[PDB]
Amino acid sequence: EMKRTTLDSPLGKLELSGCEQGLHEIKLLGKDAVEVPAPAAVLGGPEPLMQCTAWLNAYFHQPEAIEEFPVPALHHPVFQQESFTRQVLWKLLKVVKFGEVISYQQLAALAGNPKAARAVGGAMRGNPVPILIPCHRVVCSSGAVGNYSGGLAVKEWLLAHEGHRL
């Protein structure tokens, strides 16, 4: 049921996986890159996969129109059961737009528990679909960018790409 394909990007090769029920995971394989827009190794596939490739292409190469591309349905165990992690990931996906940032504290409050900023930071580690669900937009209230599953360099690259003065 699970299908996979790869896609070159400014952050290196990306491995995409999913099925008819939804996108399962977006994995960063090499942190090398390329600035020239590239197509997926294997075209077509489950609808969620095609929507993901279209979304990522727009994110990197036609950002001015990113809000116009639909986020595919997601199919991963983290989204199949109720948990604080799911609450946090879904709120992040729904609320934070391109170019905007939110603090660990603000996201915790949005998720119903203002004192759980540490757990929010921990929840970011469980995001199976980076970039798409913008965990890179969750930063420190001090102004510091904060930790990132893909490394500080990549988080800074993404934030700079979105207009921040970094």
Swiss-Prot record:
Functional description taken from the UniProt entry: Involved in the cellular defense against the biological effects of O6-methylguanine (O6-MeG) and O4-methylthymine (O4-MeT) in DNA. Repairs the methylated nucleobase in DNA by stoichiometrically transferring the methyl group to a cysteine residue in the enzyme. This is a suicide reaction: the enzyme is irreversibly inactivated.
Primary location: nucleus
Active site: 135
Cofactor: Zn(2+)
A biological process term (GO) from this entry: DNA alkylation repair
Span within the parent record: 6 to 176 of 207
Binding site for Zn(2+): 19, 24, 75
Result when mutating residue 118 to G: Loss of DNA repair activity
Family stated for the protein in its record: Belongs to the MGMT family.
EC number of this enzyme: 2.1.1.63
Domain of life: Eukaryota
Note: This enzyme catalyzes only one turnover and therefore is not strictly catalytic. According to one definition, an enzyme is a biocatalyst that acts repeatedly and over many reaction cycles.
Enzyme class: transferase
Effect of residue 146 to A: Decreased reactivity with O6-benzylguanine
Keyword Isomerase (UniProt): no
GO molecular function terms attached to this record: DNA binding; DNA-methyltransferase activity; metal ion binding; methylated-DNA-[protein]-cysteine S-methyltransferase activity; methyltransferase activity
One GO CC term on file: nucleoplasm
UniProt-annotated binding residues for DNA: 85, 104-105, 113, 118, 141
UniProt effect for mutating residue 118 to K/L: Slightly reduced DNA repair activity
Location of this chain's protein in the cell: Nucleus
UniProt keywords, alphabetically: DNA damage, DNA repair, DNA-binding, Metal-binding, Methyltransferase, Nucleus, Phosphoprotein, Transferase, Zinc
Modified sites of kind Phosphoserine: 9
Catalyses which reaction(s): a 6-O-methyl-2'-deoxyguanosine in DNA + L-cysteinyl-[protein] = S-methyl-L-cysteinyl-[protein] + a 2'-deoxyguanosine in DNA; a 4-O-methyl-thymidine in DNA + L-cysteinyl-[protein] = a thymidine in DNA + S-methyl-L-cysteinyl-[protein]
Effect of residue 104 to A: Decreases activity towards methylated DNA over 1000-fold. Slightly reduced reactivity with O6-benzylguanine
Protein name: Methylated-DNA--protein-cysteine methyltransferase
Species name: Homo sapiens
The record's free-text note on cofactor binding: Binds 1 zinc ion.
